[PDB]
Structure formats: C-alpha cells, structure tokens
Design a protein around this ligand. Structure first.
Ligand SMILES: C[C@@H]1O[C@@H](O[C@@H]2[C@@H](O[C@H]3O[C@H](CO)[C@H](O)[C@H](O)[C@H]3O)[C@@H](O)[C@@H](CO)O[C@@H]2O)[C@@H](O)[C@H](O)[C@@H]1O
Ligand SMILES: C[C@@H]1O[C@@H](O[C@@H]2[C@@H](O[C@H]3O[C@H](CO)[C@H](O)[C@H](O)[C@H]3O)[C@@H](O)[C@@H](CO)O[C@@H]2O)[C@@H](O)[C@H](O)[C@@H]1O
Lengths: 305, 303
C-alpha cells in the first residue's frame, strides 16, 4: 500500500497536544530539553503511541464524578473513559488517552449535569498537572474551581480545556511543555512512554507544528509544539501503509508553482527532522503542503533549509 | 479515483457542529421540521458547503478585538479569521466558516492577551445566537461576560466554546433552527440545502453527541449529518461520484457481519430504511464501508 501524508495545509490542521489549530512550522534547538511528548505520537504505519488517541477534541479533556476536597474550592475527579465507562488503570499506557503531557496549569470550564432532572452547571476550573494530586494513571485528578458548593456528587462531570495560566514574578516560567507530568504522582514512575526523540544527524533539528495556547491569567509561556498534526495521526492510523524504510522523505511544495520550498525526513517512528540550526519560524505560502516522495534512510543528507 | 469513507469508529470521530466527540447513531422522523445545518456539510466529491471548514477545533470559536457595551458586562467582538486576518462579509458564504448553526446560548471562556507584555486573562462568557446582536455575517457578535472592566481594547481575544445554557425545560437550544446571521438587517443567504429522505420508508441517519450543559435545563442533543473526519476525508480525496447514491455497509469486523446498510447521498447525508425514533445499537469496533454506487430507487434492507 503506498504511503502518503495528508494534503491539508498547516492552518487547516490541528495541534495533537491541545485542542487548537496549528499556526505555523517552527524549528529550534532541543539539546536543552528531553523531547518526549505523549500526545501526537504515532508511527507512519499507524501504530498509536504514548497517550495518543484519534481526535483533537478529546485532548486534555477529563470526565468523571467529583467530590469536594475538605471545605475548599478544590474538587477531586474520579476519572472515567471518554464514553463514560469505567477507567481501567491496568491498560499498558502511561495514563488515559488524551491526558495532558506537560507540566502546567490548564484552565477551562468544569461542567456537570444532574441526570435525574436535567439541571446543569459550569465553573471556571484549573488543573495543575505538576501537583502531587495529578494522578491520572491512578484514576484521579484535582481541580481548583470558582465554587465550594455547587457541584454534586455522583453526577457526570466534564472538564473542557481552554488555555493556560501562570503565576509569579518570573514571567513565562510555566507551562513547561517538554516536562512530563508524573502520571501516578509520587506513588510510582511513569510507564509505557513513547520514547524521547532527538536529531542525531549533523546539522539537523526537529521540525515542530506550532500553536499558541490561549492564556487565561498571568504571564504564561503559550508556545505548544507537536511532532505530528492530529490529522496525520488519524491518516496513518487508518491507512496503515507499511514503512518500506526507516525514513520517509517529504517535500513541502507550493501547489500553484509546483516548486519545492524545503525537504524533510519523516522518521517511521513519527517525527520530522530538517537541516537547520537555531530558532526559525519557517517562511511558507499558506497553501503549501507536504508530499511524500521516497523511502530513504536516517543518514539521508537533506538540502539545507 | 475509487471513492471511500474513513474506517474510524463512531467514538473515534468528532461532531462537525461543535468541538466534541461523537457518541452514538440516531435515526428519527424529520418531516415536521427543517433540517438545514450549515456545519458538517460537504459533498462526497469534496465540495465544502454552508459554513463548513476542516477542523472540529475551530467550530463555534470566535476571534477578534472587543469593546465593552456601555459600562455593562457585555462586549462586542469585531470578528477576524482563524489566523487573525480579515473576514470578508462579501464572500458568498452565510457567515464566517465555523459560525454556530443553531439558535442557542453557547457558554465558554473569552480569553485575551495583551501584546505588549504578555499578560493574559479569561472570563466566563455566553453568546446568544438568537440575539439581535448576533450578526456574524455583518462581522460582529456580542458576549455577556462575568466582567465589566477586565478586557482591553485593541487586543487579540478568543472565545472557546464549552457548552450550552437554558433559561425558563429543554426549550433551548433549538438545534434545527438556524440563527439569523445578519440579525434583523437581512435574511440568511448562501445556505447549504435543507435535507430530507425522498424514498419511501427512509429516514435520515444522524451522528449524535451531547453538548455539555452549563446552566439551567438545556436541550443538549446535537446531531450532525457527517462526522468532521468524513468532511476532511472527502475534501482531500475528491473522488468523483459515479452516481447520486453511495451504498455503505456498517460492518462489525469482529465477525465480518453487516449490521445495517445505508445510503450516502452525493450531496452529503445518509439515509436508512426505518420508521420511527431509534437509538442504534452498534458494536465498539463497528465502521462504515463503501461497497457500490447505486441510485435513489435502491431499496435498503431494513435497518
Ligand atoms: C496579569 C493579570 O492576570 C489576570 O489577573 C490575575 C488576577 O485574577 C483575578 O482578578 C482578575 C482581575 O484583577 C480577574 O478578575 C481574574 O478573573 C481573577 O482570577 C489574580 O489571580 C492575581 C493574583 O495575584 O493575578 C493576576 O492579577 C487578569 O485577570 C488580568 O487582566 C491580568 O492580565
Ligand atoms: C438549574 C441550575 O443552573 C445553575 O444555576 C443557575 C444560577 O446560576 C448562578 O448561581 C449558581 C449557583 O446557584 C452558579 O454559581 C452559577 O455559576 C451562577 O451563574 C442562576 O443563573 C439562576 C438564575 O435564574 O438560574 C440557575 O439557578 C447551576 O449553577 C445550578 O447548579 C443548577 O443546575
């Protein structure tokens, strides 16, 4: 089965690490980080990795029942699955599919319906994924909310993420997009992780699909880079085209002129490298798209960006 | 190019009318009312219709600058596009792509960044699409928010939708009543067509989600004609339609057994042979498979 990537333009696609559109292509140095995201991870032959699932609308969402922590404005959510069935901690994944894969304070609305009478409610809420109470692998996370009394026990509750917050004099100190949470808190180390990725070939860097997360309070670092658009994850999962070598050579083309703007290496394990050093917002026509041209190896020397 | 539909299961897909996952399949009568959604509209050969665009995460989102209405808690948003560029009201679409296509009060967060210093803010906010101030085709909508002073002028502002509210039970939203995209100033234009079965014994098949409820007693059902992933698939594939009707079989790969068959009409909606309201019962790995081009007079096996 011939391998292909989607023909959608960058801005027609979705970030695979938060439910927001892509904005641009970005390359930068990654030696200062361990780049090990768990969402947006999929092999070119369609094997999902980490905590990756198939739709952007589920990323960083949570569902379950809630109970108030003491007499505070915090609530513990006992997680269930996307379709409201019981969560299974025994599954060989790091955490429920779609769980946030960075340390940060994600703000959104926590909503609830009372089944018996159809009454509903919503409150602004934040989940701090660096908190010791962020234990999604164990089946629970904690939210700080704007209420201490309105949520009912035993009722279906959903968190819909919107953006991120920051607090402190050191501006843009959080979120930390390349620091994984401890999915089981202090109780144990992370398990079943998709591997870290790094360029190995001289002169190469990762290519990122970049968005700006909405900021909700303070001075957050709003950059969010994913390794694959969500639509590529879905495409590979469905097509399941066999990888005929370790690397798929892609050309980024202007469809109007037919000219190649740059070329890159899509590694079969699901990430892209380009030949560039330093931070660079790629200059591209908005109708540009990626095209698979041939199967190559990890030592293929790209035309420099 | 051979026509195909995605192999994703229902719960792996997204509603094309609000940024939430699909939950289930429903069929029912719809003779007594107009079915004319504007999001989730695409022909099988990839022509987008109505206000349909390509990703679910953009649906019912709004962007622009805001100005306070008087000294109230309401703010007017002067709309821009998904990437902060111009919206052209003269483009022959009903309203900006992704605009809500139902009358209801949508609640979410209105967020803002101050360009100069990177300070940010968020407030609970509702857009009433039945309001006279819901005029997206004119380039503006109005939000009621939980602040009367925190939003700044001339700064990028985004509404992220979460769910719906009600006042008065389940009388709103009205998912099949289109808002007036130009308010009282003009009638709706450039709409994707209304849809109905034409063959006796058939009903529409709906891809159903439940919108989160945020206050009161809202009607939370939300039915779309095509999953968002089908819109994106057809747009990219652009496979020619060999007839006006594609026969799909819904298959359980666990058994190879066909659960039911249905007609995917070229103009982008599905019918089944059934009379009455019915919540379909489907296996977890079930999916749709295109088998052949037929015609409007093909009789489906009863669903
Ligand atoms: C930088 C600052 O971020 C946000 O303000 C927060 C404060 O937020 C609280 O009050 C503000 C209005 O002053 C607003 O009503 C917000 O909803 C509410 O949570 C507060 O958290 C303090 C604590 O030190 O930090 C910031 O000042 C934002 O509202 C401001 O516009 C501004 O961007
Ligand atoms: C049916 C009812 O809907 C929601 O309540 C609203 C009220 O909402 C206001 O106060 C409530 C707490 O009582 C909550 O703090 C909410 O955020 C706030 O807007 C209010 O709008 C009244 C006015 O008619 O209608 C409802 O009572 C929800 O909060 C309740 O839990 C309940 O489901």
């Amino acid at each position: 089965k011939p391998f292909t990537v989607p023909i959608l333009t960058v801005e027609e696609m979705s970030n695979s690490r938060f439910p927001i559109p892509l904005e641009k292509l970005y390359t930068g140095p990654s030696s200062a980080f361990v780049v090990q995201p768990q969402n947006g991870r999929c092999t070119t032959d369609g094997v999902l990795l980490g905590t990756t699932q198939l739709s952007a609308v589920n990323i960083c969402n949570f569902r379950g029942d809630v109970t108030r922590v003491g007499i505070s404005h915090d609530y513990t959510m006992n997680l269930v699955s996307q379709n409201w069935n019981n969560y299974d901690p025994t599954e060989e994944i790091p955490a429920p599919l779609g769980t946030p894969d960075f340390v940060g304070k994600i703000q959104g609305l926590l909503t609830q319906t009372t089944r018996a009478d159809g009454s509903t409610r919503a409150h602004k809420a934040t989940v701090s994924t660096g908190s010791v109470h962020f234990t999604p692998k164990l089946g629970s996370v904690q939210f700080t909310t704007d209420t201490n009394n309105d949520f009912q026990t035993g009722q279906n509750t959903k968190f819909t993420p919107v953006g991120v917050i920051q607090d402190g004099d050191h501006h843009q100190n959080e979120p930390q997009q390349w620091v994984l949470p401890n999915y089981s808190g202090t109780s144990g180390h992370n398990v079943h992780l998709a591997p870290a990725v790094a360029p190995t070939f001289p002169g190469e860097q990762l290519l990122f699909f970049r968005s700006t997360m909405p900021g909700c309070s303070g001075y957050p670092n709003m950059n969010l880079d994913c390794l694959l658009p969500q639509e590529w994850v879905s495409h590979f999962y469905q097509e399941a085209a066999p990888a005929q070598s370790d690397v798929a050579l892609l050309r980024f083309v202007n469809p109007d002129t037919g000219r190649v703007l740059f070329e890159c290496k899509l590694h079969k394990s699901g990430y892209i490298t380009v030949a560039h050093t330093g931070p660079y917002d790629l200059v591209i026509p908005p109708n540009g798209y990626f095209r698979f041209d041939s199967w190559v190896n990890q030592f293929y020397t790209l035309a420099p960006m």
